[model samples]
Target: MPHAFKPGDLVFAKMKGYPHWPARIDDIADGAVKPPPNKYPIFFFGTHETAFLGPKDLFPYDKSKDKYGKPNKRKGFNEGLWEIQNNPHASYS
Candidate 1:
């Protein structure tokens, strides 16, 4: 399925063998983003201070469930604001 993320959307990233981590969609794969088109759509995500580009083939983070797909009953820091890191290699637009 195609990625449903867009810039500024809050989401949880599914890490292999780990719990889902909070992240924000910095940008979606497009001509402006310049990502290869052979696999999952490349998207930019981040925590609070760091940004990263990776595959966007994971399932959507549901608020009703935890990282293990179990019912979420505990209140915790599962979401937060993320900022885009400076790109020293590329000129900002």
Candidate 2:
């Protein structure tokens, strides 16, 4: 079954070593976003960073991690997710 996610929806994301919560779903597509074709662009709130992930291809956020704000690391930035990271936009809270 296809996912119900669409543009303007906010949800958690986990992939390519990057992690964020309550990201935005702005479109549906494939190609450069990721190697797969069912992927789409997801927007971040604080940093305005963006990435492409697919339905049933994402992981949910963790509970009570004892941390504040999004997580980042060298691999988190250097991985294949770099292309999707530079994109910035404003759509929701």
Candidate 3:
């Protein structure tokens, strides 16, 4: 099923081993290279980064609850976070 999302919408994007971080939908990417996957160009907040994620990797961000996240050292962090933040084009199968 296609997720009900659009550009400029605020959302929580999921990255493995980390909390769903606050992000914005920058634009819809054309995924017709083969089967035409539904890809979105997402830009994160605190980390100030961007990536192309499918609808399954995103969730509706509700500020009223604590499901979403932000960057803060007091909460503990990953040593490789900086590298991950800067490199969003890493390929996967």
Candidate 4:
């Protein structure tokens, strides 16, 4: 299923054996040559002070509610512990 996410959306990684990490969508990158069928490139910002790009499905994240439909608490990433702020790409920011 394709997630209804777009560039500038606030998202957090959801890994089973690890804690979630916050990130912001920088932009939707176009593959160097030609994008593979049904696949798209995604650029984002996270812990490291550098921009990263890869397949959008890799390490998929979510909004406030997690993949299991549970609410995410204000801790680590949600608490603004990282350099990036929650909802950093907001329109009024």
TM-score of 2: 0.46
Candidate order by lDDT, highest to lowest?
3, 2, 4, 1
lDDT of each: 0.39, 0.49, 0.58, 0.42
Highest lDDT model number: 3
Candidate 1 — which residues are off by over 4 angstroms? 1-3, 28-33, 38-93
Error of 4 at 56 (Å): 11
- Candidate 1, residues 1-93, lDDT tens digits: the string is 645455554455554544455444454435654445432322323223333435453444455124433323323322221222223122122
Instruction: Score every model by TM-score.
Output: 0.36, 0.46, 0.56, 0.38
Candidate 4 per-residue lDDT, tens place, 1-93, comes to 666555665555433453445555554436644435554333323333223434443444444434522334634433332333445554322
Per-residue accuracy of model 3 over 1-92 as CA lDDT, tens digit each: 54477776667777887577666677544763222357777776655667788878888655422533434452322322332344433321
Residue pairs in candidate 1 whose N, alpha carbon or C atoms collide under 3 angstroms: none
Give model 3's clash tally.
0
State in Å the error of residue 76, model 1: 13
lDDT tens per residue, model 2, 1-91:
5446667554556565444444556664554444256676766544556777787544332332233233456343332233233332343
- TM-score of candidate 3 against the unseen true structure: 0.56
Error of 1 at 93 (Å): 16
